[PDB]
Design a protein around this nucleic acid. Structure first.
Ligand code: BEF
Ligand code: BEF
Ligand SMILES: [Mg+2]
Ligand SMILES: [Mg+2]
Lengths: 219, 219
DNA sequence: ATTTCTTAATATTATCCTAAGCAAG
DNA sequence: TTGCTTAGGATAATATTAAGAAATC
């Protein structure tokens, strides 16, 4: 992953860079606020380590400037400004950690590791067949570029279907999926729900298997 | 929003709680790991402060297990174990931050603010949906060019709504953001608050999603 | 001293079931 | 024959009010 490091003392800068190389990340150092602005413009960084005492611009003004611009990457301020009063200012500015100089390098590597652990990991679970996009995580359904309201049961069927997509699910499975198991209606409930589901999602991407169960079209 | 605090020293434990409450979060404190274990199952916590020295089992064992079970909540270790070897170990288990005792409360509050800002928001200090502007750190909300006086609970909702905006937020979560487990109302308080909230921000920026919860509209 | 929160009785709607008269496999 | 289709009426689910307890100021 690409780490930008921002340090005005170039002696340290080469140190931080070497550490980042060594820990296994891809790294860029820059010695000033302006140069960093540039690197960020062109490159895609997974993180930013930033000193506050930069010659051209104050690090926080730089930080505040970035988030205004909707630059969202994790930032670890690594600075020599050690006041409780400062740390708060750094963290409220939108930094994701604050590490004071002097510092144990191995602390830094690990703090660095912790921010990255979450970054790569935002994976929210979707399984989709054709132009229907479904969020098992966010609960929202898309035909093309518009969205769909599915009722608790309507959603619950089309859910079970896209998990099993391509294969017929026995109808009694869906009756037990739409019910707590002790609640089974005399009339055809499942049949109505599939009709509705079909009617919105473009009937039919669910193609019916007579005498057994139901299934939906993917390939 | 709800914070779980885990502390064996009850003097501090009662202390942290008031601190957390005062910041606008609703809070649960517990004195042991096992109590913590059971609480996590029942309630939805937005962050966990976790002490290490604990009577039943060491926090790290609890943390490792949470992580093993794919518990995604941000955890801030606040411990008295300060050697650098310890600090690295916690983060590597891992915590999203590690803070040694004694500590400035105001550092803790700001670090916590930072983790939640990163978890729920893009890392952004403010959130905008439509003409709604919210400042997460100031606890302040702007509808259009005008300000909104929202009660503590009205705010805690509209906040959770805007973070998740576009995605229906499940009812059990909104409710869990507003109550400490000791205050859990028998009646339908959430339904009213949303009504009250609605009357302020207007009908209808909140679209109710039946059988699930409430959700907020952007596009 | 006044806001904010709850309680609980009543109106109200999405979603659901029901049944009847129909279309396919 | 089995499964699809429709709507008017049943049912949970959520809204509304209001005022009575709690919390803040
Ligand atoms: F110049 Be940095 F804050 F050490
Ligand atoms: F027991 Be904890 F580490 F303060
Ligand atoms: Mg410097
Ligand atoms: Mg302890």
């Amino acid at each position: 992953m690409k780490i930008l490091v921002i340090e005005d003392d170039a002696l340290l800068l080469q140190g931080l860079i070497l550490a980042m190389q060594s820990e296994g990340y891809v790294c860029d150092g820059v010695s000033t606020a302006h140069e960093a602005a540039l690197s960020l413009a062109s490159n895609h960084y997974s993180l930013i380590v930033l000193d506050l005492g930069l010659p051209d611009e104050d690090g926080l003004h730089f930080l505040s400037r970035m988030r205004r611009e909707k630059m969202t990457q994790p930032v670890l301020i690594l600075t020599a400004r050690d006041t409780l009063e400062d740390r708060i200012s750094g963290l409220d500015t939108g930094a994701d950690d604050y590490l004071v100089k002097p510092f144990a390098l191995e602390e830094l590597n690990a703090r660095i590791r912790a921010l990255l652990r979450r970054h790569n990991n935002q994976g929210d679970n979707e399984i989709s067949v054709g132009n229907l996009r479904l969020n098992v995580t966010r609960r929202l359904v898309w035909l093309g570029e518009t969205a769909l309201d599915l009722t608790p049961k309507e959603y619950a069927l089309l859910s079970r279907l896209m998990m099993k997509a391509g294969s017929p699910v026995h109808r009694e499975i869906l009756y037990n999926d739409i019910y707590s198991g002790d609640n089974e209606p005399a009339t055809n409930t499942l049949e109505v729900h599939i009709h509705n589901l079909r009617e919105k999602i473009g009937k039919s991407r669910i193609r019916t298997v007579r005498g057994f169960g139901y299934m939906l079209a993917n390939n």
